[PDB]
């Protein structure tokens, strides 16, 4: 069913899947109600989260996290983990003895919700700070924009 | 004191709801 | 009945330890043979087992039922004057009093 790929039954804790309904409603349509919310800072909840079917407890829009604290950006560099990506933040650090700059970088592991598809290497991602979700992830993807050179 | 304070809050809530609803029909009737 | 005693080095007896020699127990509040200097502390102390044996100094023993003839320095002495009870309930219980 492309949903129950685990050894426990995956469901959204807030929605109830065992409502007692009539035969006409049974023959009408078999669509579950879906829990979603807004990451309310001028961030639009995507349609793939509202109309989707996936289950992710660490998703900003459908899971159990809240976005509070910093909001940063990065470029996607690696996408080889399961529901998390590794992004890169480049910056310039000012050495004031020389009055010059050196280029520095920080690698950041962020949680990518399944509602963001067609995320490529090099696309600009906007992440927001949440509570600790694993040992090394603290930020959660909220927006994706493509690279300006790509059509 | 519990029953007294409940009484004044009931009266004040009644007046506040009345003023709010009166403003609502006064604004919506345009 | 053998109310206790203590051995050649003065270490007392604990009731629950069933041996002839001495054992080091980690005693705390409420145990006998220890008095804590501080709330919550426990001390490792030596104590003799509860079995009576020859390797010992004194047995503390209590007469529980009197014989037929008296001991001259133990049983023939009259009862001494002692403190009366303090609670009004126990005054009533000692004297069989009513609600009025």
């Amino acid at each position: 069913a492309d949903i129950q790929t685990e050894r426990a039954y995956q469901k959204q804790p807030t929605i109830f899947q065992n409502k007692k309904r009539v035969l006409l409603g049974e023959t009408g349509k078999e669509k579950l109600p879906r829990y979603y919310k807004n990451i309310g800072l001028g961030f639009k909840t995507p349609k793939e989260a509202i109309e989707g079917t996936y289950i992710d407890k660490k998703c900003p829009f459908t899971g159990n996290v809240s976005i509070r604290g910093r909001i940063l950006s990065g470029v996607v560099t690696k996408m080889k983990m399961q529901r998390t990506i590794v992004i890169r933040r480049d910056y310039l650090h000012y050495i004031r003895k020389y009055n010059r700059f050196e280029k520095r970088h920080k690698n950041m592991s962020v949680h990518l919700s399944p509602c963001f598809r067609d995320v490529q290497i090099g696309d600009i991602v906007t992440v927001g700070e949440c509570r600790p979700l694993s040992k090394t992830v603290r930020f959660n993807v909220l927006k994706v924009t493509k690279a300006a050179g790509t059509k | 004191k519990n029953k007294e304070e409940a009484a004044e809050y009931a009266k004040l809530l009644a007046k506040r709801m009345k003023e709010a609803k009166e403003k609502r029909q006064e604004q919506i009737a345009k | 009945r053998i109310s206790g005693g203590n051995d050649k080095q003065g270490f007392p007896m604990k009731q629950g330890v069933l041996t002839h020699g001495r054992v080091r127990l980690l005693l705390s509040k409420g145990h006998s043979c220890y008095r804590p200097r501080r709330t919550g502390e426990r001390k490792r102390k030596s104590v003799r087992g509860c079995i009576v044996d020859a390797n010992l100094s004194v047995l503390n023993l209590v007469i529980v039922k009197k014989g037929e003839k008296d001991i001259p320095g133990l049983t023939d002495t009259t009862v001494p004057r002692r403190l009366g009870p303090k609670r009004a309930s126990r005054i009533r219980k000692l004297f069989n009093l009513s609600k009025e």
Binding site: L41 | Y9, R16 | -
Partner: protein, 262 residues
């Protein structure tokens, strides 16, 4: 540390207490109470350093535990009891009443008030919540919880409250054009009318305030205490009226006062 602290070093004390360096190594260390440690004036500093009835802390204790000092109408014998903004201090033996409000330099002024003004105080509303069985509560800036407030009273509004009973008697909204006093930050002690509140979601709001002399200054929303409705304060103000003079006009005023007398 292994637990909470009980000592305050004198150089680490709040600077507006105006303690000196050589009297001791310790400062009076305010008790826990309705005010923060950094935003209060303890009773020993008031009765000894400012008001000078006492010469030592032992004399402060002798004054306080003869049951002479009321704070907000309640007798306090804790010598380090944290008194703070808008708190009314009453000494019935000498017939004196005070409010702890700020100078233009950010220090608690010795502000004497009328005994009818000592009947009430103002509080800034810090939270509104509904508790069990649908009962609305507000929490003020001085740790007061009042049940059943007016439904119009919101957070950042100011309640005018009666110290005899503790109930809500009047209130003032947060609105552009109301009079306010600044209780934190670099503009501590200044008074003016609110002219613009800009909102930053997920962050601190910034309120713009205009002085009675036309000077304008901004603060955070946490630092604003609304005092009077529109233009007239609902409490007595100190000798300066919230007007921060610069160092030049303060020198000029000092020289004119020295010239006029002497």
């Amino acid at each position: 540390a292994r637990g909470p602290k009980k000592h305050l070093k004198r150089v680490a004390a709040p600077k507006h207490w105006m303690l000196d360096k050589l009297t001791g190594v310790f400062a009076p260390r305010p008790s826990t109470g309705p005010h923060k440690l950094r935003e209060c004036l303890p009773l020993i500093i008031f009765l000894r350093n400012r008001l000078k009835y006492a010469l030592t802390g032992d004399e402060v204790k002798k004054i306080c535990m003869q049951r002479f000092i009321k704070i907000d109408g309640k007798v306090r014998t804790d010598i380090t009891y944290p008194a703070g903004f808008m708190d009314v201090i009453s000494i019935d033996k000498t017939g004196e009443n005070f409010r702890l409000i700020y100078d233009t330099k950010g220090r608690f002024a010795v502000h004497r008030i009328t005994p009818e003004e000592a009947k009430y105080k103002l509080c800034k509303v810090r939270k509104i919540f509904v508790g069990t069985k649908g009962i609305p509560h507000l929490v003020t800036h001085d740790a007061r919880t009042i049940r059943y407030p007016d439904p119009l009273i919101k957070v950042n509004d100011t309640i005018q409250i009666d110290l005899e009973t503790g109930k809500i008697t009047d209130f003032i909204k947060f609105d552009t054009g109301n009079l306010c006093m600044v209780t934190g930050g670099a503009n501590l002690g200044r008074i003016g009318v609110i002219t613009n509140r800009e909102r930053h979601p997920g962050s601190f709001d910034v309120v713009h305030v205009k002085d009675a002399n036309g000077n304008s200054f901004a603060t955070r929303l946490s630092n604003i205490f609304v005092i009077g409705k529109g233009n007239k304060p609902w409490i007595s103000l100190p000798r300066g009226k919230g007007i921060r003079l610069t160092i030049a006009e303060e020198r000029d005023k000092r020289l004119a006062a020295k010239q006029s007398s002497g």
